[PDB]
Every structure is written in C-alpha cells, then in structure tokens.
C-alpha cells in the first residue's frame, strides 16, 4: 500500500565475518596470535530485525 507500507530487505545468503589478529593466553601463559573467521545466516528475519536496531 503506497505511503503506508515500507520494505526492509535482509539477505538470506551466508555472511562471512573475519577477525583481525588478536592475542590469546594458553594454559602455560604462552601468548598466541589467532586469525579466525565465522560464517552466519539469519534464522528468524523478524527476530533478527528486532534484535539489531534497523537490521
């Protein structure tokens, strides 16, 4: 319906988020520098849009 309904688009494709170098402490206090990446998808589009302001 014009001027009443707006539309927000959320991409269902898997998003990839990479983490820069950061230091972690092992059990023997040996400092490590770890690079890791995560892949995530949206499960509930309404819930995701609500939880994160504006999606």
């Amino acid at each position: 319906i014009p001027f009443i309904e707006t539309v927000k688009m959320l991409d269902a494709r898997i998003q990839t988020m990479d983490n820069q170098a950061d230091r972690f402490v092992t059990k023997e206090k040996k400092d490590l520098i770890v690079d890791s990446y995560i892949k995530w998808r949206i499960s509930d589009f309404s819930r995701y849009y609500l939880a994160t302001g504006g999606g």
């Binding site: 230091r23 402490v25 206090k29 040996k30 400092d31």
Partner: protein, 53 residues
C-alpha cells in the same frame, strides 16, 4: 580479555624465549660432543700409525 600490563608482558615473552634458549643450549652441547669425538678418533689413529712407523 584479562591481559597483564605491557611492562610485565615483556617479561612473559622473555620467559618463553628463556625456555627456547634452554633447549638451544642442550642442542649446542650435543653438537659439541658429536664434533669433538671424531677428532679424538682421528688423533688416536694417527698416533697408532706413528707408533707403527
């Protein structure tokens, strides 16, 4: 994160490097042994041949 301050972080890194250096010293000692023994064998053979001569 609960990292210690930088000043003591230097000491932590020094401790790890100290572990590595501790291994390196034993490696060099074994190197010295393996180097020195054959020279002793050669000198022994040389003096034996000199006695024969």
């Amino acid at each position: 994160a609960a990292r210690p301050p930088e000043e003591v972080k230097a000491a932590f890194d020094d401790a790890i490097a100290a572990r590595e250096n501790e291994q390196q010293y034993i490696r060099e000692a074994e190197a010295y042994t393996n180097e020195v023994q054959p020279r002793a064998n050669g000198q022994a053979q040389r003096i034996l041949e000199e006695a024969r001569a």
